[PDB]
Symmetry: C3
Amino acid sequence: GAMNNTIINSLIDSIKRSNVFAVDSQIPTLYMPQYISLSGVMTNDNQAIASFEIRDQYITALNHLVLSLELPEVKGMGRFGYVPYVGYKCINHVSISSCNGVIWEIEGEELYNNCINNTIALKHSGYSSELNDISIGLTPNDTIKEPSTVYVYIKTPFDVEDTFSSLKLSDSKITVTVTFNPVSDIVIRDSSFDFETFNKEFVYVPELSFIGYMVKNVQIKPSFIEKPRRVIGQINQPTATVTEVHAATSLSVYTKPYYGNTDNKFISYPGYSQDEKDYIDAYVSRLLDDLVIVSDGPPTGYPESAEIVEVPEDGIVSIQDADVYVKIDNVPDNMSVYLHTNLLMFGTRKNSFIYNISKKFSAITGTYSDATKRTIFAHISHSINIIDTSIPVSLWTSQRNVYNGDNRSAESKAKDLFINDPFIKGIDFKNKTDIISRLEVRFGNDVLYSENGPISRIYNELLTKSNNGTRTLTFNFTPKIFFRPTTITANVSRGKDKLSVRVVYSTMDVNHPIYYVQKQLVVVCNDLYKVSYDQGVSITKIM
Amino acid sequence: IKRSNVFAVDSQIPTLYMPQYISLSGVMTNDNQAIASFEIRDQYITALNHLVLSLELPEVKGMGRFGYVPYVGYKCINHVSISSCNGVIWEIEGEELYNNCINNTIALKHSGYSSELNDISIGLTPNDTIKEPSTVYVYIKTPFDVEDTFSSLKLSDSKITVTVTFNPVSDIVIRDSSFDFETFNKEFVYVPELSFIGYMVKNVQIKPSFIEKPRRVIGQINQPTATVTEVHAATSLSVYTKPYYGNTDNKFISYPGYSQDEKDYIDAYVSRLLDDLVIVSDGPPTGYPESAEIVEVPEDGIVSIQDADVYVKIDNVPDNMSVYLHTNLLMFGTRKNSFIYNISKKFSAITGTYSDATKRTIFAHISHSINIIDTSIPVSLWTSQRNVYNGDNRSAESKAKDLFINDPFIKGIDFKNKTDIISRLEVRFGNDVLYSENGPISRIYNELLTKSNNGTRTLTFNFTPKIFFRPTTITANVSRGKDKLSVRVVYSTMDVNHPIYYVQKQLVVVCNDLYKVSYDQGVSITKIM
Amino acid sequence: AMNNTIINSLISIKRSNVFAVDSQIPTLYMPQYISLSGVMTNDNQAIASFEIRDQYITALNHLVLSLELPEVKGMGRFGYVPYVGYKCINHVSISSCNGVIWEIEGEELYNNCINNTIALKHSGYSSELNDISIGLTPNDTIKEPSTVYVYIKTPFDVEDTFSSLKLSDSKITVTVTFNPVSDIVIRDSSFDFETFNKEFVYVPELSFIGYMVKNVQIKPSFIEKPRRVIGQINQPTATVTEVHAATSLSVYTKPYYGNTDNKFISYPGYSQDEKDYIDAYVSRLLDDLVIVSDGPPTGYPESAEIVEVPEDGIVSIQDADVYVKIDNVPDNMSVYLHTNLLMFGTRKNSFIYNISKKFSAITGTYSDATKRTIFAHISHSINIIDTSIPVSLWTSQRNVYNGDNRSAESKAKDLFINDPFIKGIDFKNKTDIISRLEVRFGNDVLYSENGPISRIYNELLTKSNNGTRTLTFNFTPKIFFRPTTITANVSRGKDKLSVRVVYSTMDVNHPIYYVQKQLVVVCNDLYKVSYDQGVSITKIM
């Protein structure tokens, strides 16, 4: 027949066998789910706070919290766009509490980090060309951005095993509190945009949705919850300490830049297109306008400090050791090809090394358009990196710089954008540059873990199936919900009740503007708590 | 303290079995609808799962433009039924099978998603090969695949019949008027083969199980209501919209081919319009309708179409020639002097260089506001009775390049299902309101819970693990009249002077009913009531 | 608030609690990421040995091999193969004092990790590593130093701590055999490979998640060990002997380039799509294909047939018409077409495989400033096979014509590609050269197919886009159950798996015909892991 005779003869007895072809269908707990949406109470350092009260005899349990936000219509002049994943960037803090106190809470950045491997959650929060590309308003009544609604998935420990992990409401009042970051953090704009009026007129319009469960004869049992706690080290300090560590499931270490010493203005931004190449291309495109000029005699509208040299017959312009090959086609007979040899330059001493952005170009080819009176570039050979695109404009014109610094046109400088994204990691927009050369984790006096390479980040990325992980030390490899989590146990008598993190940062060149980008060390500790349901919901720190 | 061993486990001896990949040839029968029947009857085939239907696509020869719809294999399916002597065990509608497999990239790729299959190929001579023959594989996802051998269909001492109903070849093909579809429709035959993983089980211990059977109800044209009757034990309910193109000839201006992103659809449309939009001619252009308003671009480069300014600058234009702009390529209006929807007004800057060698304009950069809706407008709606203007002011050359698109699984009012046309959703169990929403939070939950980017407004009643538990369902009350699910939507009001306002809509409601699988004297299913 | 319809519907049978669970106290343990430096030994094959013996390491899993790639300085073109880290591996073996516990061939480890995007990215997949960089001066930096991470996926990772390798006071030795550096590098003739091969050293480090278990309760387990048999060159048969309890059997083909210098005209670099391979090839040919010259072009062999494009624009190469139109061509210059850039034939007046005939339209604009043609649009029929033809086959003895009629400039840009994990007869494994597959268990036919339905099932069941014709015998959940296997009958001679394929035949006038094939058959045998007086494995028979 259809089965091969070799198989039939091989089969056609005494040993006890587990049934792999049938199973006894277990009757589950009688329940009924419902998607419930609630309007909050807004309160106003005049920080916006949204409060959602959940109290209903029939809402036995809940999970999968989703916060929706109504983004308004943006009208006026100038350039405006929203940061990618705008919804997550709105969040400063989220708290879930009962009458007995806080059950679970997370910092805005930590919620975002936990959802970074979820493409759907990230897309829902606001990742579109409509939202993230930098739109321009021409008249005071021109529409820059159309109104839109974003959805932020507040991932909680109650979602891990669906109904099994759900937050039970033992006839108690659950309060979900959401603290919002200033609108400055979620917006990318130029000087021409009236941010002053926008900041006044903007209001966060939130709504909290969750999956509620009406359970008939619920059999509540105690559980365990991991609560994240972060410590931010002092500016440019390679150390941070998490105190009162008694039962931790994990410890994450990362770096964040600090732009308080700057006006938060950057030359370029790629918009919705967020790849490393997109950031580089947007920067190169912004510089090329002033870098290669086709003019009738020496170019005008540039500072006296600018050194604009006419390209010789051979096409090669020498900027010290660096040779720039510039060849433009269809150049009018009355005009010549010019190169800005010091577009952006930095130096600490009057005759030492100089970081010149024009030296980072080797070949520039294109064709001059008679119709539009502009140069259309064909191919650019350069060495521009993600760090260059991540340099705040202030650092080019800083007191440390002996040169003018910014030798661009006033037209180009007016196109600069303010970027206040609250969740930037490393020293660049893509968190590409690893500035941690060594990591040392001490549990008291004893060295708990040490590494010279980011193998803890490699393990984090593999074990969580994420492409954007952090240097994480995982202590729990036991299946969640069905088992009590494995934790690092303290010894208060021996002074082993704290985790001290020490990093060795990379040594950067003083004549490179990135040296002055201030760094902050972020250490995240996941503490183990026991969820008790005896006379309301309550949590107790495992010690 | 007593501790659970997390470092070692007792290796359980499983049921003695042997799997085999079995492929079968069907029986073809012919509204003259193609039906394939596969009979599975073998004493040694104890259980089966993972049904894969293969299709041998023929060589396409001749003249004109031709291409297959993306995921061609799934689009071929109209209906699939798995039945025994006692009747239907499980059945699904073609679109519902596709929806269940939309998150599976591998299944979608196997069904036919390649530049070879989906790009629009052109045949120059009557014997020129447009498309080479190919074999596509359609994964018929069934409830028997969920927990592999545990969920498998047991067919010990029973004849299982797998029936596949095929959609007309018109649905799976994108072609122009030049292509001889008449001959193709006659000459085309579906060549199917059904593969499945069969299990020869020694001393099988069969137990009863539960199965979710999908039921869809399609409402009438433009009716914002649909009702699913005799709902007694449902695990989920999905609501979506489908466009109806019966009032049209199913012809569209452009198609991107294999490249399926929203931008790909937009770029293909812009590219098709640019041929007539900016013209380099020796005096006023010819070959356009009298209704066309082709204006010469001034020295300034700016052409004003009412409130809209179009910047047109072309390089290397011959001294005897001028640059022209079609100011009303596609226009729509319900009244003489009302709001006019002009496609030429959706362009702000057009730059390029004229080629002396090829005697054509090579466009460099286009600044425009063209959307996914524009690319999804059937040509018929531009020239409809409701339009006071001519509508289609393109050249006869451009109109001849229009393609017929009859894809059976289109959702919403656009090719990417980007635009949400449902403003409100109301679901009623009997007469009482079961669920209501003003935002697509049920779609957001569906997309999150299923880890899908192409979800639907779904109400899930079952959050209990499948196979190992009896599914949680919405229970009926026949005495109280709660034995039906009524869906009512409020469609979002669009502008009357926009052609997409005239795309007819059909409401689709999908209900997953719970059934009990019994193996006492053959395989049989019983509706849970 | 809950809807009244739901409340009324709810407000004796034994029910399983789906809203709460008893949190079981697990085995007391403490994990640790442990990194170890090896011992390097060296015909003259690099071998790394890692010894694991510690009282505080009871169990281990998730082996990750780090490799320090050095700074590459000098002249010429250089780049690393995609997923460089995996390509470095020739063999990996985990053994105890009682012998080998588990081992895998380099290609098989890569195949098992092909469905893991993270593992592949970690091993080295970046424009920095995989794009072909050029060194201009003898001290110019071609490639900056980098660290790659190779995830050695083992059966101990399946169910985390449950599947982990237990070290019952025994010494575990992890041995990694490395492929020559030639295999992981794409370079031109200009690049001093001789010095590079001498100066290059594999710098490995083995990381693993170690577990310190208090009062471990060890129980025996089951392990699947992969075995592969490589058939005789071009032979459509291969046999795996002593098959007693196998969980699966995979069949695939590999090309063999021993009859060539392993040089190829083009390479896309980091961009690895079929189109990227094609575009890179077209771009490399266009330099010599369309020439703007003051009179007939020079610097080409006498064998080259370079025809001036007529006023019409169409050049006829027998049956094939090539439309060539270039803008801004100087008055003193003309447009030329190389009508036989690459040509092949086994007979003097028979069928010719001409690469120039594979082009229908070539448009562009001449640049006065750079004195070169900037191509705008190319209409062609170039395929993945064309890009996969070794240069040697164009100039082979079988070819009556010269073959390679390109310029010396173009020929100097050719790259050596020695990637050890190539499948099929093309770089993308696009062409399916197996027409039929027959698998025999002893003398009886176990399975046969005319279409790759076993590959389709493999791709679906493993959620992979790069699967192989695989026969799976085990559909039982791993670790918690003893795997289901094919059962041998030694008395009936049913103790071996014999694979016979029917290959489709290529055209003899197409250079690809001369690409050698190798049939690869992979068998996963079932073994029992015993911990009684050290770790040991026993073949299930």
